Design an enzyme around this catalytic site. Structure first.
Site, PDB file in Angstrom:
ATOM      1  N   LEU A  56       1.131  -0.948  -0.018  1.00 53.30           N
ATOM      2  CA  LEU A  56       0.207  -0.002   0.279  1.00 53.30           C
ATOM      3  C   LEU A  56       0.753   0.737   0.114  1.00 53.30           C
ATOM      4  O   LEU A  56       2.303   1.559   0.645  1.00 53.30           O
ATOM      5  CB  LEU A  56      -0.659  -0.232   1.010  1.00 53.30           C
ATOM      6  CG  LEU A  56      -2.064  -1.177   1.168  1.00 53.30           C
ATOM      7  CD1 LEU A  56      -3.143  -0.952   2.619  1.00 53.30           C
ATOM      8  CD2 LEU A  56      -3.180  -1.218  -0.571  1.00 53.30           C
ATOM      9  N   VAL A  59       2.807   2.856   3.637  1.00 50.55           N
ATOM     10  CA  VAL A  59       3.222   1.764   4.467  1.00 50.55           C
ATOM     11  C   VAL A  59       4.176   1.279   4.040  1.00 50.55           C
ATOM     12  O   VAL A  59       4.534   0.879   2.965  1.00 50.55           O
ATOM     13  CB  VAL A  59       2.430   1.006   3.852  1.00 50.55           C
ATOM     14  CG1 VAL A  59       3.149  -0.209   4.719  1.00 50.55           C
ATOM     15  CG2 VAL A  59       0.522   1.232   5.160  1.00 50.55           C
ATOM     16  N   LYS A  66       6.600  -3.538  11.894  1.00 51.86           N
ATOM     17  CA  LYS A  66       5.579  -3.459  12.780  1.00 51.86           C
ATOM     18  C   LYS A  66       4.461  -4.058  13.255  1.00 51.86           C
ATOM     19  O   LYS A  66       4.096  -4.445  14.444  1.00 51.86           O
ATOM     20  CB  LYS A  66       5.593  -1.993  12.799  1.00 51.86           C
ATOM     21  CG  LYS A  66       6.122  -0.906  14.508  1.00 51.86           C
ATOM     22  CD  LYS A  66       7.097  -0.055  13.900  1.00 51.86           C
ATOM     23  CE  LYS A  66       7.590   0.801  14.633  1.00 51.86           C
ATOM     24  NZ  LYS A  66       8.357   1.825  14.291  1.00 51.86           N
ATOM     25  N   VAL A  97      -5.199  18.649  26.478  1.00 48.14           N
ATOM     26  CA  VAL A  97      -5.085  20.434  26.654  1.00 48.14           C
ATOM     27  C   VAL A  97      -5.005  21.199  24.942  1.00 48.14           C
ATOM     28  O   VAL A  97      -3.630  21.581  25.319  1.00 48.14           O
ATOM     29  CB  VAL A  97      -4.696  20.474  27.948  1.00 48.14           C
ATOM     30  CG1 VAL A  97      -4.973  22.118  28.027  1.00 48.14           C
ATOM     31  CG2 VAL A  97      -4.590  20.054  28.938  1.00 48.14           C
TER      32      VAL A  97
HETATM   33 NA    NA Z   1      -2.920  20.563  22.357  1.00 51.81          NA
HETATM   34 NA    NA Z   2       4.838   0.690   0.068  1.00 51.12          NA
END
Ligand code: NA
Ligand code: NA
Ligand SMILES: Nc1ccn([C@H]2C[C@H](O)[C@@H](COP(=O)(O)NP(=O)(O)OP(=O)(O)O)O2)c(=O)n1
Ligand SMILES: [Mg+2]
Length: 327
Positions: A56, A59, A66, A97
DNA sequence: CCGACGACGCATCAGC
DNA sequence: GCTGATGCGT
DNA sequence: GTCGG
């Protein structure tokens, strides 16, 4: 597709993305991890191998490996470690925040401030924005159902027409595209006596009117063209009061209005894709204007634009109504 | 091997 | 005081 | 981290 297809992977990637952004301060790794998270989330198959994922666009070798580890074990060693880490996760949480980015977040943790409790204990150390963002930490993560968005639009459109009959207000964002819930409110605003070659009070008047009728409650940032603040629906009778909501108001020149409307309607995934198609054909679009690309890559002058449709009437494409701009 | 990777308004900051 | 840089949200 | 000059 469905979430549970490769949801474990997309979540894994999204977690990784946020740590890159907030702890490592590597914004382009953060966008990389997300791009992979997106292209995978739309890939209508259950990924069997990391090599299958590698096919893809977005990727590569690292994520592919991974995914091998995750599929084979159900988790990631590096990720479990960074989760249990006190300093990295504290930094990662504080950035939730609004007003606190990764830099201020690490400052706080480095001097021993790790939680909202710690923040509230030390509000003097926070700037204005961060106080508001902290004050409404809860509210700002709630979503806004379209029903409440419509009532909000009612007030915004009414209070705007009340200040000056000739204002033109448009609520954009996911609201305009039709989403049943929204993250915030995006208001776009123009007026016949504001163009590219044109009071510095046009935005002010609208904001303060919305303040007087007690719709807008707090201000995060206000300039001559851009407003970021907080708003709240009036309470309904017995019913318990509404959550405070994020609202943005942008003042745009009349001739740049429909380019702005197109841009802030989105989605960004839609925008990112209209921009190229625009390229292919010899046109460059930003939030301001559409301009022809010359022999070299020279931008001529911006073409006249009187509608969203006019913009499609330059890249020779037929209208796609906001409803179907899902991407 | 190495640079691009989205860019802008506004608030505070570094510095003169 | 000012200009410019940096951080931030988007 | 990924892609491509
Ligand atoms: Na923030
Ligand atoms: Na690729
Ligand atoms: N990083 C981003 C994200 C969006 N945008 C643009 C395209 C968006 O559709 C538009 C409004 O941004 P937005 O409020 O964050 N997203 P949107 O309203 O589409 O969905 P919500 O999460 O607000 O419900 O500005 C941008 O310029 N930069
Ligand atoms: Mg929105």
């Amino acid at each position: 597709p469905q979430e549970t297809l490769n949801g474990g992977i997309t979540d894994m990637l999204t977690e990784l993305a946020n740590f890159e952004k907030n702890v490592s301060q590597a914004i382009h790794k953060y966008n990389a991890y997300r791009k992979a998270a997106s292209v995978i989330a739309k890939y209508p198959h259950k990924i069997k191998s990391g090599a299958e994922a590698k096919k893809l666009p977005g990727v590569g070798t690292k994520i592919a490996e991974k995914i091998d580890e995750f599929l084979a074990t159900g988790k990631l060693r590096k990720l479990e470690k960074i989760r249990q880490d006190d300093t990295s996760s504290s930094i990662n949480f504080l950035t939730r925040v609004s007003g606190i980015g990764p830099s201020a977040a690490r400052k706080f943790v480095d001097e021993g401030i790790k939680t909202l409790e710690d923040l509230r204990k030390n509000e003097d150390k926070l700037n204005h924005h961060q106080r508001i963002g902290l004050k409404y930490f809860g509210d700002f993560e709630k979503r806004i159902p379209r029903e409440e968005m419509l009532q909000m639009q009612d007030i915004v459109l009414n209070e705007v027409k009340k200040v000056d009959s000739e204002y033109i207000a448009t609520v954009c964002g996911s609201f305009r595209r039709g989403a049943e819930s929204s993250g915030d409110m995006d208001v776009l605003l123009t007026h016949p006596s504001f163009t590219s070659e044109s009071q510095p009070k046009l935005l002010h008047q609208v904001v303060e009117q919305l303040q007087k009728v007690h719709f807008i409650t707090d201000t995060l940032s206000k300039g001559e063209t851009k407003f970021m603040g907080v708003c709240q629906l009036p309470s309904k009778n017995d019913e318990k009061e509404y959550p405070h909501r994020r609202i943005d108001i942008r003042l745009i020149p009349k001739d740049q209005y429909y380019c702005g409307v197109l841009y802030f309607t989105g989605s960004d995934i839609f925008n990112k894709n209209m921009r190229a198609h625009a390229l292919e054909k010899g046109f460059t679009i930003n939030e301001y204007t559409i301009r022809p690309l010359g022999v070299t890559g020279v931008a001529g002058e911006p073409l006249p634009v009187d509608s969203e449709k006019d913009i499609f009437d330059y890249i020779q494409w037929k209208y796609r109504e906001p409803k179907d701009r899902s991407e």
